[PDB]
Amino acid sequence: SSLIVEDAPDHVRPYVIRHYSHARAVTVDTQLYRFYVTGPSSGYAFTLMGTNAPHSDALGVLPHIHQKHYENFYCNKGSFQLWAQSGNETQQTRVLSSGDYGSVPRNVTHTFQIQDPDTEMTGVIVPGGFEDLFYYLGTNATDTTHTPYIPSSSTTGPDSSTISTLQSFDVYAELSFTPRTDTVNGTAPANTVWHTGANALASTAGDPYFIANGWGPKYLNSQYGYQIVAPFVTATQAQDTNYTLSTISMSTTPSTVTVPTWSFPGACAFQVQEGRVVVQIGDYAATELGSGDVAFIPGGVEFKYYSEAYFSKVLFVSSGSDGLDQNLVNGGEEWSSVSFPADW
Amino acid sequence: SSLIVEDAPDHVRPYVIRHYSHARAVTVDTQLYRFYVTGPSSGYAFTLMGTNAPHSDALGVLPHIHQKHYENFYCNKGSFQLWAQSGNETQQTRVLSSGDYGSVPRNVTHTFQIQDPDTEMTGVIVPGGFEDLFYYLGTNATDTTHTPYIPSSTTGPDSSTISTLQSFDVYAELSFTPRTDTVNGTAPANTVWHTGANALASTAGDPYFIANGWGPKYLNSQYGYQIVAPFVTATQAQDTNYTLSTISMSTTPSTVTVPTWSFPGACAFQVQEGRVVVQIGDYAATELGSGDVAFIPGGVEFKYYSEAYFSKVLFVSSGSDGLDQNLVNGGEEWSSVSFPADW
Numbered sequence: 001s002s003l004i005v006e007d008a009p010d011h012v013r014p015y016v017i018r019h020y021s022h023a024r025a026v027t028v029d030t031q032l033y034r035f036y037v038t039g040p041s042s043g044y045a046f047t048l049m050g051t052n053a054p055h056s057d058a059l060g061v062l063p064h065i066h067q068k069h070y071e072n073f074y075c076n077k078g079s080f081q082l083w084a085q086s087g088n089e090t091q092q093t094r095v096l097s098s099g100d101y102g103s104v105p106r107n108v109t110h111t112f113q114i115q116d117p118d119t120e121m122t123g124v125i126v127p128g129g130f131e132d133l134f135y136y137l138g139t140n141a142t143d144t145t146h147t148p149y150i151p152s153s154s155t156t157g158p159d160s161s162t163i164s165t166l167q168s169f170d171v172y173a174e175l176s177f178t179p180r181t182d183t184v185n186g187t188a189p190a191n192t193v194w195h196t197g198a199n200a201l202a203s204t205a206g207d208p209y210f211i212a213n214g215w216g217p218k219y220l221n222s223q224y225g226y227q228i229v230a231p232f233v234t235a236t237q238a239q240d241t242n243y244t245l246s247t248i249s250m251s252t253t254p255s256t257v258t259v260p261t262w263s264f265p266g267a268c269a270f271q272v273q274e275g276r277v278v279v280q281i282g283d284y285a286a287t288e289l290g291s292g293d294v295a296f297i298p299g300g301v302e303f304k305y306y307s308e309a310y311f312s313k314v315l316f317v318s319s320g321s322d323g324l325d326q327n328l329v330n331g332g333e334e335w336s337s338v339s340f341p342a343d344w
Numbered sequence: 345s346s347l348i349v350e351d352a353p354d355h356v357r358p359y360v361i362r363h364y365s366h367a368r369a370v371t372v373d374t375q376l377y378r379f380y381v382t383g384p385s386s387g388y389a390f391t392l393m394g395t396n397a398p399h400s401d402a403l404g405v406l407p408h409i410h411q412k413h414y415e416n417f418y419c420n421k422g423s424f425q426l427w428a429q430s431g432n433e434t435q436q437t438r439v440l441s442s443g444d445y446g447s448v449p450r451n452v453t454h455t456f457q458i459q460d461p462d463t464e465m466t467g468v469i470v471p472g473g474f475e476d477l478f479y480y481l482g483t484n485a486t487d488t489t490h491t492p493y494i495p496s497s498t499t500g501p502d503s504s505t506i507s508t509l510q511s512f513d514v515y516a517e518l519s520f521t522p523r524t525d526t527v528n529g530t531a532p533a534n535t536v537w538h539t540g541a542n543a544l545a546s547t548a549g550d551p552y553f554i555a556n557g558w559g560p561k562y563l564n565s566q567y568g569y570q571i572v573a574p575f576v577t578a579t580q581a582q583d584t585n586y587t588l589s590t591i592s593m594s595t596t597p598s599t600v601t602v603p604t605w606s607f608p609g610a611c612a613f614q615v616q617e618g619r620v621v622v623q624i625g626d627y628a629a630t631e632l633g634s635g636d637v638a639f640i641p642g643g644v645e646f647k648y649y650s651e652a653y654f655s656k657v658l659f660v661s662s663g664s665d666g667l668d669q670n671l672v673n674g675g676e677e678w679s680s681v682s683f684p685a686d687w
């Protein structure tokens with residue numbers, strides 16, 4: 001009944017789960033998966049999971065597609081390469097480092113490879129419930145000490161025979177996919193923009209796209225102190241998956257501004273990337289979250305949040321087309337900085 | 345009074361300063377500098393400064409040498425290129441992204457260039473007091489909202505002026521040409537950068553670089569698990585007499601007494617990830633989050649532990665056997681950024 005839990009609840013309720021909590025941990029070879037938000041806990045709205053893993057010289061999974069789930073790759077720390085292709089379009093790949101984002105809509109072939117020793121991927125998958133696949137293929141991990149991954153080259157995860165057998169989990173093998181190997185400066189093909197210029201969201205649903213940290217479109221909202229929304233997924237890209245995804249960066253709330261109360265139709269969640277954010281959900285205590293910590297708010301439940309740190313940034317997901325990030329966008333203005341103004 | 349302060353104190357005392365606190369802020373063009381530890385606040389042991397800045401197509405400073413200060417570049421977030429050269433050794437450069445490190449000994453020519461929009465560099469300079477340079481070069485900033493930085497010529501002093509700063513220990517090197525053959529964030533070719541192990545320089549006076557996670561590590565199991573990744577040891581510091589490293593931490597099991605420490609030299613840390621509780625001398629325990637800095641005067645007892653399941657701090661100590669060396673010495677060589685899954 002307490003707000004903070006060590007594994008996501010088995011039903012919809014408000015909760016906070018700290019970074020590297022047990023969270024129904026499993027390993028798949030060297031990778032350790034944690035399920036901070038699950039299907040049961042979000043009423044099937046989304047999954048928010050963390051994967052920690054060491055450098056590997058091999059792919060982290062064979063190339064595959066999902067026909068009914070939209071996958072979102074966010075780099076919390078370290079780095080990992082992501083490859084994706086839609087239909088007939090040119091195959092794209094990027095090396096994501098901290099704060100970088102990669103969108104993989106339904107029916108886009110993809111795979112990834114962990115580069116740096118202390119790498120963390122946060123996956124947001126829509127709708128929720130996809131994690132059964134990781135329960136199934138994974139091995140339960142007790143991880144008493146809560147170490148990020150278990151200390152310790154074939155492709156990780158199911159072999160080619162096994163991954164061709166997983167249609168029930170919405171996984172479909174793409175064994176003809178060949179990850180391109182002409183990466184230079186973290187990108188291929190060469191005619192792309194990655195850490196060198198602005199990144200746009202895709203013009204329509206179904207196409208993969210990547211946003212490097214700080215380089216995507218941003219909006220300043222000035223209504224409750226300053227907040228900068230960096231959209232990753234909007235209605236345009238979500239369509240019938242019916243969600244949004246962004247980061248929200250926040251200043252403190254000035255003493256003359258009342259911290260607003262929110263209550264949305266759809267469930268939402270965030271994970272703190274930088275800073276110290278206080279969340280007050282329902283009748284529970286105002287609780288301060290630090291890096292990697294996750295807060296989950298059921299639809300229809302009132303909550304307040306504010307940044308106790310002078311600057312905080314969170315990864316934010318909402319079920320619905322009108323969640324917090326979109327509300328702040330709609331109420332704000334186009335903005336060209338990762339910083340907010342120096343004056344109120 | 346309070347352990348927490350909004351600017352570094354003007355004398356030595358235990359303190360914490362939150363990330364993006366005013367910290368005597370100045371701007372140099374687009375860059376904003378915050379002085380979390382100063383000469384006065386550390387009794388001249390070291391300076392620890394944060395620099396927040398947007399992408400620039402121009403150098404962040406003209407190339408220069410310090411004859412008396414050892415400079416340490418740590419990338420908190422975003423990315424910046426660092427160039428360095430000792431003597432007639434090969435000129436080295438690396439693009440540092442989050443958690444990466446560059447070592448700039450005395451008499452090493454260097455410059456940097458900001459790449460990513462949300463870039464933060466943490467400078468650790470030994471000895472302390474180097475900040476007087478930025479008081480002269482920089483313009484005071486009120487920054488009422490504490491924004492990281494205020495929303496193509498080389499940034500900072502021009503060729504004339506940078507040749508005029510020898511009294512701050514800054515010597516111009518205007519003939520230095522930063523090399524322009526960078527590939528995958530490094531040059532020359534056949535350097536190792538996020539693709540394999542990085543060793544500390546074994547020769548004093550040489551620059552070196554350690555990519556996040558790729559340096560030597562030591563596991564200490566004496567008080568919970570702590571992993572120390574050295575960045576500067578006695579080999580490199582010599583008479584500058586300090587150590588620098590990250591320390592990663594498990595929680596402290598309830599069966600282990602959180603140790604009380606005391607060391608003759610001042611030390612400090614800035615939280616990079618997680619949530620670290622520090623109790624210094626006579627003050628209340630305070631929990632630190634991302635970018636927060638704790639300063640402990642030499643000779644003052646303190647305790648720390650991780651409230652988070654994993655935390656990582658950047659740690660600097662005056663003297664040759666401060667906390668990080670003590671943890672190494674009591675620990676073992678270790679090959680992982682993660683600690684064991686069992687106590």
Ligand SMILES: *[C@@H]1O[C@H](CO)[C@@H](O[C@@H]2O[C@H](CO)[C@@H](O[C@@H]3O[C@H](CO[C@H]4O[C@H](CO)[C@@H](O)[C@H](O[C@H]5O[C@H](CO)[C@@H](O)[C@H](O)[C@@H]5O)[C@@H]4O)[C@@H](O)[C@H](O)[C@@H]3O)[C@H](O)[C@H]2NC(C)=O)[C@H](O)[C@H]1NC(C)=O
Pocket residue numbers: 184185190402403425521522523524525526527528529
């Ligand atoms: C992968 O990424 C790297 C970046 O990490 C890319 O590297 C860049 O590559 C381009 C193309 O090769 C280089 O741009 C060229 O630079 C030439 C050399 O420039 C020096 O010499 C000039 C003449 O003597 C001089 O004018 C020039 O100064 C100018 O730029 C300075 C910036 O360093 C600045 O301080 C000066 O005031 C002045 O404006 C240089 O000293 C130049 O002759 C060309 O015309 C061209 O601009 C970049 O310099 C490279 N950058 C780095 C940091 O190495 C690489 O191409 C990427 N690879 C792929 C395949 O994408």
Ligand SMILES: *[C@@H]1O[C@H](CO)[C@@H](O[C@@H]2O[C@H](CO)[C@@H](O[C@@H]3O[C@H](CO[C@H]4O[C@H](CO)[C@@H](O)[C@H](O)[C@@H]4O)[C@@H](O)[C@H](O)[C@@H]3O)[C@H](O)[C@H]2NC(C)=O)[C@H](O)[C@H]1NC(C)=O
Pocket residue numbers: 081095178179180181182183184185186527528
């Ligand atoms: C900059 O960093 C890049 C990584 O981000 C480096 O890219 C790597 O480049 C090497 C050498 O060119 C590639 O390794 C080669 O790959 C080819 C192709 O491999 C694929 O096809 C074969 C044959 O059908 C198959 O057997 C493989 O499994 C692959 O599917 C091999 O033929 C070579 O023998 C060799 O392994 C890397 O693949 C490539 N990695 C990536 C992720 O693109 C790049 O070299 C760096 N640049 C510089 C100048 O240093």
Ligand SMILES: O=c1c(O)c(-c2ccc(O)cc2)oc2cc(O)cc(O)c12
Pocket residue numbers: 028051060061064071072073074121122123124133137156157158171
């Ligand atoms: O289908 C899969 C998948 O989408 C991903 C994934 C997506 C986002 C993340 O953030 C992390 C992993 O990994 C996998 C690993 C396997 O071993 C087998 C799979 O079928 C998948």
Ligand SMILES: O=c1c(O)c(-c2ccc(O)cc2)oc2cc(O)cc(O)c12
Pocket residue numbers: 372393395404405408415416417418465466467468477481499500501509514
């Ligand atoms: O001498 C200088 C110096 O060392 C550095 C620096 C070192 C470490 C950091 O983390 C940040 C800045 O910047 C400078 C900027 C100037 O305009 C002028 C200078 O003379 C310096």
Ligand SMILES: *[C@@H]1O[C@H](CO)[C@@H](O)[C@H](O)[C@H]1NC(C)=O
Pocket residue numbers: 067106107
């Ligand atoms: C994905 O592809 C499958 C198989 O062709 C198709 O039936 C389905 O409608 C597609 N889904 C989307 C959202 O494109």
Ligand SMILES: *[C@@H]1O[C@H](CO)[C@@H](O)[C@H](O)[C@H]1NC(C)=O
Pocket residue numbers: 087088
């Ligand atoms: C992609 O190309 C193939 C030709 O091989 C074609 O059959 C298919 O319809 C194309 N897709 C679209 C969206 O038109």
Ligand SMILES: *[C@@H]1O[C@H](CO)[C@@H](O)[C@H](O)[C@H]1NC(C)=O
Pocket residue numbers: 139140141142
């Ligand atoms: C759970 O994990 C352990 C090792 O962590 C493994 O040996 C075991 O088979 C798994 N499943 C069961 C039934 O315990």
Ligand SMILES: *[C@@H]1O[C@H](CO)[C@@H](O)[C@H](O)[C@H]1NC(C)=O
Pocket residue numbers: 242265266267299319320321
């Ligand atoms: C989108 O989600 C919102 C919030 O959960 C919900 O109210 C709405 O019914 C959804 N729209 C559709 C078409 O499913």
Ligand SMILES: *[C@@H]1O[C@H](CO)[C@@H](O)[C@H](O)[C@H]1NC(C)=O
Pocket residue numbers: 411450451549
């Ligand atoms: C740095 O260079 C100066 C000038 O050449 C020299 O006098 C001094 O000894 C050097 N210092 C170190 C530590 O190498």
Ligand SMILES: *[C@@H]1O[C@H](CO)[C@@H](O)[C@H](O)[C@H]1NC(C)=O
Pocket residue numbers: 368479484
């Ligand atoms: C800038 O702040 C400094 C302290 O570093 C102070 O002495 C000085 O008065 C300020 N400069 C101006 C012009 O106000």
Ligand SMILES: *[C@@H]1O[C@H](CO)[C@@H](O)[C@H](O)[C@H]1NC(C)=O
Pocket residue numbers: 585608609610642662663664
């Ligand atoms: C190194 O610093 C320590 C603590 O500040 C001090 O005790 C000692 O005198 C110094 N050692 C040398 C060799 O100067």
Ligand SMILES: [Cu+2]
Pocket residue numbers: 064065066071110
């Ligand atoms: Cu997938």
Ligand SMILES: [Cu+2]
Pocket residue numbers: 408409410415454
């Ligand atoms: Cu310098």
